[PDB]
Amino acid sequence: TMPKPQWHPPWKLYRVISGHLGWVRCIAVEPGNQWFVTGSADRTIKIWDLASGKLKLSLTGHISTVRGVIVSTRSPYLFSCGEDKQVKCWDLEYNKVIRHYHGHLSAVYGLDLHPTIDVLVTCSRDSTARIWDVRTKASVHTLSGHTNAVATVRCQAAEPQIITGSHDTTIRLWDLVAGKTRVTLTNHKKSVRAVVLHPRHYTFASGSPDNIKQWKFPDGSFIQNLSGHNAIINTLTVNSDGVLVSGADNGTMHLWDWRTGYNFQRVHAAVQPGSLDSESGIFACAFDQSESRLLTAEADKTIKVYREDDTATEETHPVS
Amino acid sequence: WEDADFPILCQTCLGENPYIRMTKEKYGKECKICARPFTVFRWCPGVRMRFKKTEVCQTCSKLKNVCQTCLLDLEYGLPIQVRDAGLSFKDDMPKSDVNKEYYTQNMEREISNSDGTRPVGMLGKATSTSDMLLKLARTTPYYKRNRPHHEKPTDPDDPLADQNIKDRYYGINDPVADKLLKRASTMPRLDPPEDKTITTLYVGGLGDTITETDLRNHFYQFGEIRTITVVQRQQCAFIQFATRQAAEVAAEKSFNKLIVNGRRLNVKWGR
Amino acid sequence: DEEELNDYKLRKRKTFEDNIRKNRTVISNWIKYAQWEESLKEIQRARSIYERALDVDYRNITLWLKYAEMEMKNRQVNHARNIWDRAITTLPRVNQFWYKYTYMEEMLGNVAGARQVFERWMEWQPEEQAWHSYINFELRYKEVDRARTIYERFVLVHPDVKNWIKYARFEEKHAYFAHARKVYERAVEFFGDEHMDEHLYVAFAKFEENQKEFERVRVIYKYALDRISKQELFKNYTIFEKKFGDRRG
Amino acid sequence: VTKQRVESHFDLELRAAVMHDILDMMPEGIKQNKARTILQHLSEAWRCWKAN
């Protein structure tokens, strides 16, 4: 029912970090694969060297969980956002807050910086999202309409520029400038938390308890229903070679190929020493810039780092 | 954002000049009814005339389709009291502030989801014409209105001077409509007979061009007719209709309008 | 009557309105108002109620069904059609809606509009039961070509050998043994060596048995078991018993 | 958020996060799993952790 799926070598766990004192809610990578940022519910924000796996820095911004961060590739800025109703921006030469965009009403849940228009787009459990001027603390649009907490946003240059998925189980595509709803999709049954945009196929996938779904831009054409990783899914991350990663809620991490939707690996990770298994979980993922290694921030205060498997061949690992 | 790129006004509020210069100021003022910021149009209704504006939300102009700068029915030129009372339309647009503003914004959402040409709601559903409305209608352009409000100023004892715009729109206490409604109540109409058994229609002035053929041809629309007796002696035609409801409909229909071959023949109760 | 019933009307109107006022929730009070005013046969008032509750919650199928059934009872065919199309436009998966709607098409008698609605419906590829309601409809009139075209699109939208076997049984029932032999041949062609299984080839052996071609029955049975997956134990045994039946009978 | 409402706030955020997560995943008690009762059991589990 499909052309024979390609062969991607599996992934093996090799390096494990344990430095936080709470859940690790979000994690991002620096433009040049030298260091990655972590934001936790311990309220810290910790910068780590990507090579030596050593904690380069820690900074005590928030008042509660840091629910999401993002590093600027057009500046030495780093934007944090947390359930303290507030969003902050750090200069990373002087390591300090430089402006704070007030305005939301409840816990921010996630955010993204638009690659070319210098704005932020942040989603919040207050049933909205907003578009922020970078510098001047100006919000141009309250992208509104989701009947509940806008569980995530991703933004991109092309039309449409803003996709937001929610606990209303809907997905919504917005025109940025008029700040208006353009299109809705409502295929899902259970809330939808993870949306990811392909780098070179003008497409995007959304995850929910039921299973992943795939769509074609700019319209919202359903494509290809991906099933198999039946667990509350928390982040989707896609790689250069079409490797697509779904981190589930309960630790079970699943891999597939983007083209055929071929679930070709299940990794089922082991918790730290002191953590009961029931505290297992995955909360965010990110491939490095060079896309060789993979970071995953788990729900037991640890950051696990997987590497492409080098000893893999078609016979070591056949495709079926 | 209430935004009109067109004005909703009859020729009466428009002005006599076929070439009108009109400026628009968006959100220049809130709706006096809706409290909604809408585009106000400013244009000179004539040389030596008042340079007027459009002041209502397109909600308010659309729902009751009163010429926004005339507040007059764009089809009837008539005040809201006379219009609604002639279409028997008791328009219960709520009086309270919350209900008024919210319902005006709601009829505005309904206007934007309607073609914007025909009214959104119940009054735009009673397009059943009124003969008394035709009687009250003024088909001439009241350009002298377009002048400003050097003459003896409006007398305070005449109940028209103090102009009540809000109630005169929302359906209460229109003085000019009350006067014209007294006029259209005292206007000539066919009173029904106390003697119930005669379906006896007299036609006075039927003339030499109308024969019994064309007479019954006009009489056909209202119901069965038993007998016809024309007298060129009195230029009259006495028709006995078979039905009482038929004769009543024929009476109200042909009273003061029926023109058979150009001339109005007096439809009267028989004697 | 004149005023004593008007009193009753004001009272209970305000009671219903006050109840749904305090609540704004469950359409129990809504629907009871709908029936209050349909028993008063104020159809426009009850319809306004219906639309107000539609705005309250546009997602109640029994609410839409109350609407439609009231329209059927008070004969407002065009408005019932309006309601029907609105629903099915809004909830393409509520097959109660398509079912009762095409039922309405049959009641009004317009088999043409029945066909059209069934057509718009099959676009959602609803389900085997939907195609089969479609085919029972199409077979309340003869329409044999339409019948087999329904079957042909159906067994491809739901490409199940069992659906194909229903197609084959319908072919036999309507005496198209030519097209039915072609049904089974094309069916094994499509299903291919990869995944095909017992029931199809036992069915082919049995059809050819009824055609009295025992030699071809046996070439079918053995050649198929050799070409495809064979074995496991209960399948081999039952197939061998059906082959014994094909031989003897 | 200010040191006064830190506790009440974080509590609100926690209870609601629980509601979202499970009582959108665990159902198939679809009507309402008596979430309110599952949250009563939450509170009781806490109490008992506090009292060992």
Binding site: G145, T186, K189 | - | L91, R93 | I30
Partner: peptide, 23 residues
């Protein structure tokens, strides 16, 4: 009054057995 509700392009439910109905 917001924009009209888009059709709920949805799946059908598969009802609750006694097993998970008690589970």
């Amino acid at each position: 009054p917001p924009s009209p509700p888009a059709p709920v392009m949805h799946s059908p439910s598969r009802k609750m057995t006694v097993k998970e109905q008690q589970e």
